[PDB]
Amino acid sequence: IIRRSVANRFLVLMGALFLSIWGTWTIINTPVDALPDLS
Amino acid sequence: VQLKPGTSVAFSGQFELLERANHKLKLMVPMTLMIIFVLLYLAFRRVGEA
Numbered sequence: 857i858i859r860r861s862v863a864n865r866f867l868v869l870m871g872a873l874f875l876s877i878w879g880t881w882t883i884i885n886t887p888v889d890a891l892p893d894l895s
Numbered sequence: 896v897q898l899k900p901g902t903s904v905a906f907s908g909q910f911e912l913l914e915r916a917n918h919k920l921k922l923m924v925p926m927t928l929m930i931i932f933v934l935l936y937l938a939f940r941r942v943g944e945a
Binding site for chain 1: 933936937940
């Protein structure tokens with residue numbers, strides 16, 4: 857599980873980069889609020 | 896033709912749907928290219944051939 861992932865590390869790095877881009881987008885595009893709806 | 900304050904002019908009908916579909920198709924190409932490149936690296940394991 858660890859050895860089989862370090863072997864093909866190029867795909868892992870590409871996936872990590874894509875995840876970083878997607879997460880940055882989702883973060884800059886997330887709504888905001890003060891407190892969750894307790895009503 | 897000169898406009899008047901308080902009135903607007905908007906084209907509707909097939910043109911609105913055409914513009915919507917055009918924007919969607921314009922922003923849809925990157926996803927296709929990325930999927931193709933990913934599945935190509937999955938098969939050749941090299942960026943060069945991909």
